[PDB]
Every structure is written in C-alpha cells, then in structure tokens.
Design a protein around this ligand. Sequence first.
Ligand SMILES: *C[C@H](C*)C(=O)OCC
Ligand SMILES: *C[C@H](C*)C(=O)OCC
Ligand SMILES: [Cl-]
Ligand SMILES: [Cl-]
Ligand SMILES: [Cl-]
Ligand SMILES: [Cl-]
Ligand SMILES: [Cl-]
Ligand SMILES: [Cl-]
Ligand SMILES: [Mg+2]
Ligand SMILES: [Mg+2]
Lengths: 232, 232, 9, 9
Amino acid sequence: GAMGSMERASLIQKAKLAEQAERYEDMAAFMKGAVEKGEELSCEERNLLSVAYKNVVGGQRAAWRVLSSIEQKSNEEEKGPEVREYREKVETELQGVCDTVLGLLDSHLIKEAGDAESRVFYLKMKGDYYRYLAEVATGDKKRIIDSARSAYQEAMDISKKEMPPTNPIRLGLALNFSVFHYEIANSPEEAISLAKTTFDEAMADLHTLSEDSYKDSTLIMQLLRDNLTLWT
Amino acid sequence: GAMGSMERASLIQKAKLAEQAERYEDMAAFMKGAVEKGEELSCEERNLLSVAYKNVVGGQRAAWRVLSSIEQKSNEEEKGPEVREYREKVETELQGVCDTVLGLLDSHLIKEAGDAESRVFYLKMKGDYYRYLAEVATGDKKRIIDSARSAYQEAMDISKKEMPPTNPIRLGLALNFSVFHYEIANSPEEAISLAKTTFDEAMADLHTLSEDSYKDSTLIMQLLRDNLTLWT
Amino acid sequence: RAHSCPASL
Amino acid sequence: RAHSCPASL
Ligand SMILES: *C[C@H](C*)C(=O)OCC
Ligand SMILES: *C[C@H](C*)C(=O)OCC
Ligand SMILES: [Cl-]
Ligand SMILES: [Cl-]
Ligand SMILES: [Cl-]
Ligand SMILES: [Cl-]
Ligand SMILES: [Cl-]
Ligand SMILES: [Cl-]
Ligand SMILES: [Mg+2]
Ligand SMILES: [Mg+2]
C-alpha cells in the first residue's frame, strides 16, 4: 504494498511523524514501505525500522504473557476455550509480525549489507525476531532456537573483529544474546559469562570515547550490570 | 460483522481478557460484536464498551494533537504536504471510530434504553463522540457542536430528575459537559458555573453514601475541583 | 488543560 | 526478569 506509490523520502518523513505521535503500527508500515524501495538504509533509517517493529512486537509480547499466565492458572473451574482461542489469536499476530521482519531481512537487507555496522545490525535483528518466535514456540522449537543462536553468533564474530568494545550495537547485541542464553536456551552460566566479559572489555575501552560516546556506551553497560545483579 | 459467529457470552469474556492485556482495539471489536447481538447491555457491559472506545479514541486524539501542532508550527521552511497528509489520515481514522460508536448508539442502544441509568449513559456517550468530532471539525462544525450540546442537555435533564447528585455518571456527565462549554463552545462562564453547582450539590448529598459510594463520588468531584483551579 | 472524565469505568 | 536492549535507538 500500500506504500508503493509514495516517495521514499516521504515515507521516511512520515515515519518520523508517526514516532513523535507514538503511532508505531503506522511507523512500521511506512518503514516497510521504505525498505521495499530496494535502496540500502542509512544509519538513521535502520534505527527507525528497529524502533518501529520493537514497539509493535513489544505490545504483542506483553499481551501474550498476560494471557499465557491466565491460561496456565486455569489448568490447576472449567471456563471454556475462550482464553486459549484469544491467546492463539494474539500469538498468531505476533508470529505474522516476526515473519514480516524476517522476510524483509531475507529480501534483501542482509545480502546487500556489506559493511560490518549494517551487517551486525541486521543479524542482531534476525536473532531477536527468532528469539521472540522461540518464546511462544511449543511444537519447531529446536529449529527456531538454532536459527536465533546462529544469527547472534555470526553477528558476534563480525562485531568482535570489526568494532570497538564500546560500540553501542556491539554492547546491545551482547546484552540480547545473553538474555537468549538465560531465558531461551537454558544456559544461565553462558549468560553470566558473556555479560561479564562484555562489561569488562567495554570498561577498559571507555578512555577512548568522547563525552557523547561515553554517555551512550555507559547506558547499556548499566543494563548488563542490572542483569548480572539479578542473575548472580 | 466478523464477530457474528461467536457467542455473546464469549465476546464479553474475551473483552475482559483484552482489557487485562491492554488490547483495546480487540476489546472494542469484541464489544461491538456483543452489541450487534441485539440484546440490551447490563451495567458491567456498558462500562466495558465505554472503556474500550475511550481508549481507542484517546490514542487517536493524542496523535492528532501532536500532528496538528507540528502542522501549525509549519505555517509561520517549505517541507511538502506530508504533515497535512498524515494529519488527515489520522483525522479520518478518528472520524471513522466516532462514526462507529454513533452508529451503535443510533442502532439501537438509545431507542431501546428505557431506564434513566442506561439512557443517561448512552446520551452522554453520544455527547462525548460528537465533542471529539467537533475537536477536529473545520468546515459542518456548527451542526456537530449543536448535536453534542443537544445530547448532553437531554442527559442532564434526565439525570437531574432521576438520579441523586452524587451518582458517578451524573458527576462525570457534568464534568464532560463543562469541558464542552470551555473548550468547544467558547463559554468559560458556563463551564465554571456548571462545575461549581455540580460540586456543591454533590457535597451536600455525601452524607447519604456508604463508604464505597463515598469513595467513588469523591474521586470525580476532585476532577471538577482540579478543573475549577485551572479555570478560575 | 482541563481533564474530562477518564477510564474509572 | 532480565531486561533486553530497549528503544534507545
Ligand atoms: C538493540 C539495542 C537496543 C542496541 O544495540 O541499541 C544501540 C543503542
Ligand atoms: C464518563 C465518566 C468517566 C463517568 O461518568 O464515569 C463514571 C465513573
Ligand atoms: Cl500504533
Ligand atoms: Cl479470539
Ligand atoms: Cl543466519
Ligand atoms: Cl490495541
Ligand atoms: Cl499518509
Ligand atoms: Cl440527541
Ligand atoms: Mg469449583
Ligand atoms: Mg529558511
């Protein structure tokens, strides 16, 4: 597509307006539109894409969890299939949104990404969207988990080789990969180890950052530490 | 409709689940479904309807205001028609939602409402949805404003005759009618007067309420007073 | 600006 | 529970 007749620059402009208006579904459709124009995305453009879909999927995941626990509490009076039906409805929409993002990545963001920064970005996105599928998978599950692991690992290899330890996407990648280990892959020890090594390596590289870079890196470093406080 | 094949009681049950999951668009479709079954709504059922649509329209109104002020700030560098296009898109959706509610009221909630409590409820809802149309109307506007005034006034006449001054819907009706006077009809003096008389009459009737009724009435009385503090 | 009646319902 | 990377972007 419905965005096929709007100018690329117009879609981007409207995505920024949808962001300011907190209209993330709109924002997500504009950015999908923008991607399907077939030109590679700038740094700013990637951020808008990611913000849009994370907000849409964040609302869905939160609804799922509410409903999924109402459902588990009902298997411990017979109420009917309504809870399950609605939980499946929400689940199905969630899966459609992950499938949309994973389709954009496969057609053709990942293969056209030649620079480390863009390539890491997209492989991290791939990891995160398989991780969200994995959170709801029951049947399938093992394949989805391996697809997540595989994307995250590839991104980690590139980021280790090509980016300084304080790079915010490197830190955010590692934070998300360690949440994968802990919550999805049943590997607390791997989660803790990764979070610790990532924090320590960033700490020892801070002296190279300007004041602005310093602010950015330390914000996500704090989230690694918050997690470590919970896990240890 | 898409809800035509689901049981009335199932739609209600799922509306309560959508409420808990903060899925208000879903909630709104379930309740529309429930209304179109053609049976009158209970007190609880009316509340769910109202909560669902107020949440949907509240998000839209807030987006509109953000965008409408970006638009006014751009008439004071030439950016293109994107701001206007998107503001019209949001506006159009808003109008579709008000038109949906006003259609449910006309077919056939209002005419089947014989008791004061249900009748006041629906006429207040009618007032509020014309008021929201009026907020965006430019061309039309005078007719919309009179439709709002007319619904609110009819509700006030019934509530004055049929309900005690501390009844929460009577208080909420008056609060909303006075916001109408102040923000829509350009009548600050009418807004202040109505808020004052409503507060005073409730105050002098509190001694009849139980502890629970007392809590409910005083909560919206506080909102009248907040408004009066701003306006005077 | 003035508040109308919220949620509460 | 553990927090993943938010918004920030
Ligand atoms: C994905 C995550 C939030 C990230 O790396 O953000 C960079 C600031
Ligand atoms: C419409 C308004 C919020 C109302 O009367 O609520 C009753 C508690
Ligand atoms: Cl949205
Ligand atoms: Cl359903
Ligand atoms: Cl891969
Ligand atoms: Cl919603
Ligand atoms: Cl538009
Ligand atoms: Cl009327
Ligand atoms: Mg029992
Ligand atoms: Mg200039």
